[PDB]
Amino acid sequence: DIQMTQSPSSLRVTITCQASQDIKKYLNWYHQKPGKVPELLMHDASNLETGVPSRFSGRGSGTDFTLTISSLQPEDIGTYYCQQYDNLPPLTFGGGTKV
Amino acid sequence: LGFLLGVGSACASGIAVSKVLHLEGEVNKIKSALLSTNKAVVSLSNGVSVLTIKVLDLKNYIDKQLLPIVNKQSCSISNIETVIEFQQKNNRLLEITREFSVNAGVTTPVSTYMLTNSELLSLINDMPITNDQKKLMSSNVQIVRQQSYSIMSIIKEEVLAYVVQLPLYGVIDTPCWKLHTSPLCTTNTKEGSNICLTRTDRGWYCDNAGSVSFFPQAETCKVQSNRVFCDTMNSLTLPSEVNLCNIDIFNPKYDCKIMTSKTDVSSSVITSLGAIVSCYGKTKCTASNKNRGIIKTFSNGCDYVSNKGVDTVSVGNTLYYVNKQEGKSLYVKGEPIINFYDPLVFPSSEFDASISQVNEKINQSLAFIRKS
Amino acid sequence: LGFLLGVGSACASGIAVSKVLHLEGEVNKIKSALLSTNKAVVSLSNGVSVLTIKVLDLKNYIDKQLLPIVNKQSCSISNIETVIEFQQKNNRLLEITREFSVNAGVTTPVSTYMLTNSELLSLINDMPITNDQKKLMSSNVQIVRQQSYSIMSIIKEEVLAYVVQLPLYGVIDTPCWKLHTSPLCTTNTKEGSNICLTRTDRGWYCDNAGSVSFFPQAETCKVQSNRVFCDTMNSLTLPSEVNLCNIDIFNPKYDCKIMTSKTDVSSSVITSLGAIVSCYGKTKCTASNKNRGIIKTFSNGCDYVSNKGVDTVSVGNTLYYVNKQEGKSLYVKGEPIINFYDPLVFPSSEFDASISQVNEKINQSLAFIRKS
Amino acid sequence: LGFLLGVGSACASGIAVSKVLHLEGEVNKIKSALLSTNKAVVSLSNGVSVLTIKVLDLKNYIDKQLLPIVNKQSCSISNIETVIEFQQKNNRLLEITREFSVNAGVTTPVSTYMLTNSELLSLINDMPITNDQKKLMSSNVQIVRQQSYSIMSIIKEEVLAYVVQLPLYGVIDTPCWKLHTSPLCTTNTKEGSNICLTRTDRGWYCDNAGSVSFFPQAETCKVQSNRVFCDTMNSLTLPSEVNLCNIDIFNPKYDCKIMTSKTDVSSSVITSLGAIVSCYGKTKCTASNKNRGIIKTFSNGCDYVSNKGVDTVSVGNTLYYVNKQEGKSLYVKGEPIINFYDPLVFPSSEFDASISQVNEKINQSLAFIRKS
Amino acid sequence: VQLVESGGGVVQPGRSLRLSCAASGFSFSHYAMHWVRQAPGKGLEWVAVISYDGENTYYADSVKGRFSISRDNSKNTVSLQMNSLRPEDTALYYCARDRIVDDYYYYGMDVWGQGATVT
Amino acid sequence: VQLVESGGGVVQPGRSLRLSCAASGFSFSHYAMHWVRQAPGKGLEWVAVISYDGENTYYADSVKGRFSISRDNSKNTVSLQMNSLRPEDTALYYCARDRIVDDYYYYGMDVWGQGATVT
Amino acid sequence: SQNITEEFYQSTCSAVSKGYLSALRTGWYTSVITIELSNIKENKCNGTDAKVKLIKQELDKYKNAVTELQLLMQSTPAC
Amino acid sequence: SQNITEEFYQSTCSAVSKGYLSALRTGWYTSVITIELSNIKENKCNGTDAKVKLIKQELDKYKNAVTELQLLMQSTPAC
Amino acid sequence: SQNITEEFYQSTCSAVSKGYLSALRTGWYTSVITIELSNIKENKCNGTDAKVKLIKQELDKYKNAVTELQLLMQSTPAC
Ligand SMILES: *[C@@H]1O[C@H](CO)[C@@H](O)[C@H](O)[C@H]1NC(C)=O
Ligand SMILES: *[C@@H]1O[C@H](CO)[C@@H](O)[C@H](O)[C@H]1NC(C)=O
Ligand SMILES: *[C@@H]1O[C@H](CO)[C@@H](O)[C@H](O)[C@H]1NC(C)=O
Q: Which residue of D has its CA nearest to H28?
A: D167
I and H adjacent (3 or more CB pairs under 8 angstroms)? no
D19: Cα separation from own chain's centroid? 29
Class level of CATH domain E3-118: mainly beta
For chains I and F, having 3+ Cβ pairs within 8 Å is answered no
C–F: how many Cβ contacts below 8 A?
21
| Widest CA span in chain B | 111
D129 vs D137: CA distance, rounded Å: 11
Residues of chain E in Cβ contact (below 8 Å) with chain B: 53, 100, 102-105, 107
Which residues of E are less than 8 Å from A85 in CB distance?
Answer: 106-108
HEC states along B186-238?
A: CCCCCCCCCCEEEECCCEEEEECCCCEEEECCCCCCCCCCCECCCECCCCCCE
Task: Give residue C307 CA to ligand 1 midpoint distance, Å.
Answer: 50
Give D90→chain H minimum CA distance, Å: 7
Distance D365 CA to ligand 3 centre (A): 11
- Residue D356: CB atoms within 10 A of its CB come to 15
Whole-angstrom distance, CA of residue D334 vs CA of residue A79: 82
Q: How many residues does chain H have?
A: 79
Closest chain E residue to A44, measured at CA: E107
Q: How far apart are CA G33 and CA B153, in angstroms?
A: 10
Helix H or strand E encompassing D106:
strand D106-107
Between strands F67-72 and B301-302, the pairing is: unpaired
DSSP letter (8 states) at residue C56: -
E55 to chain B: closest CA residue: B328
- Provide the shortest C-alpha distance from residue G58 to chain B (in Å): 7
Please name which of D296, D330, D300 lies closest in space to residue D313, comparing C-alpha atoms: D296
CA–CA min distance H27, chain B (Å): 7
Cβ of residue C141 closer than 8 Å to a chain G Cβ: yes
Q: CA–CA separation, E41 vs E84, rounded Å?
A: 25
Q: What span, in angstroms and rounded, lies between the C-alpha atoms of C201 and C188?
A: 27
Burial class (CB in 10 A: 0-12, 13-18, 19+), A83: buried
Partner chains of E (3+ C-beta pairs under 8 Å): A, B, D
Q: Which helix (H) or strand (E) holds C89?
A: helix C80-100
Minimum CA distance residue for ligand 3 atom 9: D363
- Return the ∠ at Cα B287 (arms to D134 and B204), rounded to 5°: 100
Cα C323 to Cα C311: distance, rounded to the nearest angstrom: 8
Q: Does the distance separating the beta carbons of E101 and D20 come in below 8 Å? A: yes
Instruction: Please say whether the beta carbons of D301 and D353 come within 8 A.
Output: no
Are E102 and B324 inside 8 Å of each other by CB? Answer: yes
Q: What residue segments make up the domains of chain E, in order of their start?
A: 3-118
Q: In a 10 Å sphere around its CB, with 0-12 CB exposed, 13-18 middle and 19+ buried, how is residue F84 labelled?
A: exposed
H/E segment holding residue B142: helix B141-144
User: Which residue, by CA, sits nearest to atom 8 of ligand 2?
Assistant: C363
Distance separating alpha carbons of residues D319 and D332, to the nearest angstrom = 27
The phi-psi region of residue C303 (left if phi > 0; otherwise alpha if psi is between -120 and 50; otherwise beta) is: beta
For residues F76 and F29, the answer to whether their CB atoms sit within 8 Å is: yes
CA distance E118 to chain B (A): 35
Q: Does B181 touch chain G (CB under 8 A)?
A: yes
Residues in chain D closer than 8 A to C16 (CB atoms)? 311, 321, 323-324
Q: Which residue's CA is minimally distant from atom 6 of ligand 1? A: B363
Atom of ligand 1 nearest to the CA of B367: 13
In terms of DSSP bridges, do strands D149-154 and H14-18 run parallel, antiparallel, or are they unpaired?
Answer: unpaired
In 3-state terms, what secondary structure has residue D24? coil
CA proximity to C358, closest of C341, C344, C371, C337: C341
C-alpha closest to that of D332 among G53, B200, H7, F47: H7
Alpha carbon nearest to ligand 2 atom 7, residue: C363
Q: Pairing between strand C203-207 and C212-215?
A: antiparallel
* CA C254 / ligand 2 centre spacing (Å): 18
Residue A43 in contact with partner chain E when CB distance is under 8 A: yes
Q: Please state whether B143 falls in left (phi above 0), alpha (psi between -120 and 50) or beta.
A: alpha
Instruction: Please judge whether A93 and E61 are an interchain contact, meaning their C-beta atoms are less than 8 angstroms apart.
Output: no
- Interfacial C residues in 342-371 facing I (CB < 8 Å): none
d(CA C151, CA C10): 13
For ligand 3, atom 10, the nearest C-alpha belongs to: D363
Ligand 2 and C367: CB distance under 6 A? yes
Residues of I with Cβ-Cβ distance to C153 under 8 angstroms = 32
d(C-alpha I19, C-alpha H77), whole Å: 47
Judge: H68–B222 Cβ closer than 8 Å, yes or no.
no
Straight-line distance from the first to the last Cα atom of chain E, in angstroms, rounded to the nearest whole number: 29
SS (H, E, C) E50-79: ECCCCCCECCCCCCCCCEEEEEECCCCEEE
Cα separation, B259 vs B348, whole angstroms: 9
Using a 10 angstrom Cβ sphere, with 0-12 exposed, 13-18 middle and 19 or more buried, the burial of residue B302 is buried
Partners of residue A94 in chain E, C-beta under 8 Å: 43
Residues in chain C: 372
Strands (E) in chain C, as ranges, are 40-43, 49-53, 106-107, 149-154, 160-172, 176-181, 196-199, 203-207, 212-215, 257-261, 269-270, 275-276, 278-279, 285-289, 293-297, 301-302, 312-315, 318-321, 328-332, 353-354
Ligand 3 atom showing the smallest separation from residue D370 Cα: 13
Q: Which residues contact D56 (CB under 8 A, 6 or more apart)?
A: D92, D93, H35, H36
Measured between beta carbons, which residues in chain B are less than 8 angstroms from residue E104?
A: 308-309
Residue of D17, D154, D230 with shortest CB distance to H30: D17
* Separation between Cα atoms, residue C163 and residue C154, nearest integer Å: 9
Ligand nearest to the CA of D359: 3
The CB of D102 under 6 Å from ligand 3? The reply is no
Q: Does ligand 1 lie within 6 Å of residue B365's CB atom?
A: no
Is any atom of ligand 3 closer than 6 Å to the C-beta of D363? yes
Q: Does C169 touch chain I (CB under 8 A)?
A: yes
Q: Whose C-alpha lies nearest to ligand 3, atom 11? A: D363
- Please report the atom of ligand 2 found closest to the CA of residue C366: 13
Closest partner residue to B224 (CB to CB) among H53, H54, H75 is H75
C367 interfaces chain D, CB cutoff of 8 Å: no
A97 to chain E, any CB pair closer than 8 A? The answer is no
- Give the long-range contacts of residues C282-288, CB within 8 A, separation 24 or more: C282/B239, C283/B237, C283/C315, C283/C316, C284/C314, C284/C316, C285/C314, C285/C315, C285/C316, C286/C313, C286/C314, C286/C315, C287/C312, C287/C313, C287/C314, C288/C312, C288/C313, C288/C314
In ligand 1, the atom with minimum distance to the C-alpha of B370 is 13
In a 3-state reduction of DSSP, which class is residue D136?
Answer: helix
The answer to whether A84 contacts chain E (CB < 8 Å) is no
G29 to each of A65, B14, C129, F25, how far by Cα in Å?
71, 9, 46, 68
Cβ neighbour number for residue B358 with a 10 Å cutoff: 20
Q: Which residues of B touch G78 (CB under 8 A)?
A: 104-106
Angle E99-E104-E108 from CA coordinates, rounded to 5°: 30
Residue B133: other Cβ atoms inside 10 A: 16
Measured from the alpha carbon of residue D364, the closest ligand is 3
Touching check for D87 and chain I: CB below 8 Å?
Answer: no
**Phi and psi for C63 in degrees, rounded to 5?**
-70, -35
Cα of C364 vs centre of ligand 2, distance in Å, is 9
Q: How far apart are CA D233 and CA C298, in angstroms?
A: 47
Task: Decide: B15 and B244 in contact? Cβ < 8 Å.
Answer: no
Residues E86 and E81: their CA atoms lie apart, in Å, by 14
Q: Separation of E9 CA from ligand 2 center, angstroms?
A: 102
> Which among C118, C143, C319 has the least Cβ separation from residue G64?
C118
Phi, psi of B50 (to 5 degrees): -85, 165
C-alpha distance from B224 to closest chain H C-alpha (Å):
5
> What whole-number distance in Å separates Cα of residue C50 and Cα of residue C164?
11
Give DSSP secondary structure letters for B42-106. EE-SSS-EEEEE-----HHHIIIIIHHHHTSSS-----HHHHHHHHHHHHHHHHHHHHHHHHTTE
Query: How many other CB atoms are there within 10 angstroms of residue D253's CB atom?
Result: 10
Q: How far apart are CA B135 and CA B123, in angstroms?
A: 13
In total, the C-beta contacts within 8 angstroms joining chain A to chain E are 48
